[PDB]
Structure 1
Amino acid sequence: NTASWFTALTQHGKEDLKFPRGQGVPINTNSSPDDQIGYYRRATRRIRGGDGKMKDLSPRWYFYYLGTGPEAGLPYGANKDGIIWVATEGALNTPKDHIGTRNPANNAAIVLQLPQGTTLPKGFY
């Protein structure tokens, strides 16, 4: 029933999502500098293509604060396929249960915006 607090980043290439150190956490004026830590989770989508076989669509990457989302129990830095970690300089390695996930019935998604000088990888928008 719950979802990410932000809209997705679309992957148009083969390479997975990877940000430089200290970059990647979306802007959120309601969160504090301590809370600037989390991960992006890939959501693969497939449809009945124009021919007759299942064609894959461009995957989407959704941000979730540390200790929240479908991988709430994973610690920061854990190695898992479809999960890449991000953190701003000075963020605490603690779960963000106080922020939690978004319930779509009461709240719309925040438009994902990255701070000034952020280097998005090739094929990510």
Structure 2
Amino acid sequence: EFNVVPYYSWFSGITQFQKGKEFEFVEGQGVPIAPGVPATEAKGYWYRHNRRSFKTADGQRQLLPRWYFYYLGTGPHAKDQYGTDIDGVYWVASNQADVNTPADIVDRDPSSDEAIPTRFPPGTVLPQGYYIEGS
């Protein structure tokens, strides 16, 4: 969880379960499906939530990262330039998207909307070592 309120993603998270496997998508893929959004707005980034646990007194490690998707110009990196090398950020965009203008899309009031469970179109190459939440 969090003890500082996050920007909330329109979608469910993707969670690492195998250490050492990278988070990635093929260029053009990796934008989660949202009913009615045009491919020109299908642009943004996945953002890594580092999680950390507590020591139990039986010794006991691991609580891997979970990634959350944010449309370009929103989220904790609402200001950065698409593409920019930033630890913990992975940019993705449909090939119809112009990544020079922010997506025209409001954040998600977590109280007047649940997260849309994360799906991808047929053919999307899923990152091995990750489990899509809600699936």
- Same fold, TM-score > 0.5, yes or no: yes
Note closer, same or farther for the CA distance 1:53–1:74 as it changes in structure 2 (3 Å cut): farther
Spell out structure 1 runs of 4+ moving beyond 6 A.
none
Instruction: Determine the structure 2 residue equivalent to 1:62.
Output: 68
CA contact (8 A) 1:38 1:63 kept: yes
Task: Give the stretch that moved more between structures: 29-38 or 68-77.
Answer: 29-38
How do 1:2-17 and structure 2 match up within 5 A? 2-13=7-18, 14-17=20-23
Q: Write the letter of the residue equivalent to 2:85.
A: N
The SS at the match of 1:34 is: coil
Unaligned runs of 5+ in 1: none
TM-score (norm 1): 0.90
* 1:18 equivalent in alignment to 2:24: yes
Alignment partner for residue 107 of structure 1, among 96, 104, 113?
Answer: 113
Alignment partner for residue 38 of structure 1, among 37, 40, 44?
Answer: 44
Matched residues, number: 124
Unaligned runs of 5+ in 2: none
The SS at the match of 2:40 is: helix
The SS at the match of 2:69 is: strand
Give how far 1:58 is off.
1.6
The SS at the match of 1:23 is: coil
Distance 1:54 1:7 in 2: 27
Instruction: Determine the structure 1 residue equivalent to 2:102.
Output: 95
Instruction: Determine the structure 2 residue equivalent to 1:47.
Output: 53
Q: Write the letter of the residue equivalent to 2:67.
A: W
Give how far 1:121 is off.
1.5
CA contact (8 A) 1:39 1:66 kept: yes
% identical aligned pairs: 43
> Alignment RMSD, CA only?
1.8
Give how far 1:22 is off.
1.0
Distance 2:91 2:108 in 1: 20
The SS at the match of 2:90 is: strand
CA contact (8 A) 1:40 1:84 kept: yes
CA contact (8 A) 1:4 1:64 kept: yes
TM-score (norm 2): 0.84
